[PDB]
């Protein structure tokens, strides 16, 4: 799974201009063209740009692309509500097939809301089952895009993690969840675990420890 790096998310009001960036290795993007795709939620992707800066018969003047060196850029002017989607960059290097991470573009339809992060430790009941699970719940936030990260004694953790993508609530705001699965040994043999949620540049970090 070799991949091109993108920002997690950007957001702007109706009519404003956005810019999205790709970046990667010289043996990939440094020597090959770049494409851009639009994936509306719940549907398949759709080509927006190819050969760095060419628009297919069917995408407006509003979308534009530009590459220089080991970086590429997508730009959307005069945002409409129907431009809300994820945007993936892609390149072909012979064997080819390299996508971005990529980036969600939110077109604000309501006031920005900061997430209320709630972190739960494993229940003693679950620990009696010789297993442990840390549940980080993210609630009441807009735009609906976040980035969760776990840490053990302020050291990064990557294995044993599963994160759901943000889903609409009844109040039309978003919520998400993340699980860190441990063994009771790991749980007890650490001073502290922490769930770090990033939302619109800001980062919230809740913490939990054994009893």
């Amino acid at each position: 799974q070799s991949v091109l790096t993108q920002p997690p998310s950007v957001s702007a009001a109706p009519g404003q201009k956005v810019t999205i960036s790709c970046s990667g290795s010289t043996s990939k993007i440094g020597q090959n063209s770049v494409s851009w795709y639009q994936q509306l939620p719940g549907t398949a992707p759709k080509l927006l740009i190819y050969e760095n800066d060419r628009r297919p018969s069917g995408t407006p003047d509003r979308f534009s692309g530009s590459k220089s060196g080991t970086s590429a850029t997508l730009a959307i002017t005069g945002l409409q509500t129907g431009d809300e989607a994820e945007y993936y960059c892609e390149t072909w290097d012979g064997s080819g097939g390299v996508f971005g991470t990529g980036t969600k573009v939110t077109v604000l339809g309501q006031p920005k809301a900061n997430p209320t992060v709630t972190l739960f430790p494993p229940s003693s009941e679950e620990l009696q089952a010789n297993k442990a699970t840390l549940v980080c719940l993210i609630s009441d936030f807009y735009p609906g895009a976040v980035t969760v990260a776990w840490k053990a004694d302020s050291s990064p953790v990557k294995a044993g993690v599963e994160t759901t993508t943000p889903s609409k609530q009844s109040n039309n705001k978003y919520a998400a969840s993340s699980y860190l699965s441990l063994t009771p040994e790991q749980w007890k043999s650490h001073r502290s675990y922490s769930c770090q949620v990033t939302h619109e540049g800001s980062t919230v970090e809740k913490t939990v420890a054994p009893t």
């Binding site: 892609e90 064997s95 097939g97 996508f99 739960f120 679950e126």
Partner: protein
């Protein structure tokens, strides 16, 4: 109207094999290359394999090279992905996508000197995907039906904020989907949110159902989450009480 439609998806045990089938229409199928792009929901797009318009060149991603196989039958406007030795990490929604570069063959096989046969043009794809299908879901799990273990997400000082307490239920290790959760037999619906399920490496699903309530009610009002898993015919009722030893949250009684 241009259309790509996939099929063959479903639940399948690891180690086993599975063949997906992409049917093309609305254009000259034999003039374009074809690709398979998968997407673990919603972890983002990953490129699997691709084939040149003549069927001469095969490309594979590092994750699947050696295990998976591609081919095409221009006479049927079909396009196949033979998946072998399936891994639990092959779980994804598989899209078939048309290659951007339109080519006219300029080199065929003439099977007899009186007349034709397959195109054999050595070219040659662009690597950009200008048409996409609806996608077909391929779940990989060795699990058989199993009931959930329900654990409490007890409310505490680290879940209260602004006079509103947050509590829930961890529904762990079940299979298959779905699991429907309720609170107080459906009496409590305000503030309730049940998150999407999460497929673990174990092969089992897990989800959480959380509800927000007045922090003052925790000492008088009772909150039961009603988990329901019809596949395994299970109904769990967990009464969630505030965290036992918590100074930073006062509770009545």
């Amino acid at each position: 109207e241009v259309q790509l439609i996939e099929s063959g998806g479903g639940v399948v045990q690891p180690g086993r094999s599975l063949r997906l089938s992409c049917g093309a229409s609305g254009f000259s199928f034999n003039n374009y290359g074809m690709h398979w792009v998968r997407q673990a929901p919603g972890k983002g797009l990953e490129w699997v394999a691709g084939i040149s318009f003549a069927g001469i060149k095969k490309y594979y991603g590092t994750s699947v090279k050696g295990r998976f196989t591609i081919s095409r039958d221009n006479s049927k406007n079909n396009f196949y992905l033979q998946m072998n030795s399936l891994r639990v990490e092959d779980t994804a929604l598989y899209y078939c996508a048309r290659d951007l570069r339109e080519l006219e063959c300029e080199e065929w096989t003439l099977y007899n000197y009186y007349d034709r046969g397959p195109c054999v043009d050595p070219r040659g794809v662009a690597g950009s995907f200008d048409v996409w299908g609806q996608g077909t879901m391929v779940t990989v799990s060795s699990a058989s039906t199993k009931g959930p273990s329900v654990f409490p997400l007890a409310p505490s000082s680290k879940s209260t904020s602004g006079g509103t307490a947050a509590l829930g239920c961890l529904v762990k290790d079940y299979f298959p989907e779905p699991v429907t959760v309720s609170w107080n037999s459906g009496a409590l619906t305000s503030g309730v949110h049940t998150f999407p399920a999460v497929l673990q490496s174990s092969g089992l699903y897990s989800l959480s159902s959380v509800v927000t309530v007045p922090s003052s009610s925790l000492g008088t009002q009772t909150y039961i989450c009603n988990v329901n898993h019809k596949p395994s015919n299970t109904k769990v009722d967990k009464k969630v009480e505030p965290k036992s030893c918590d100074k930073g949250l006062e509770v009545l009684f």
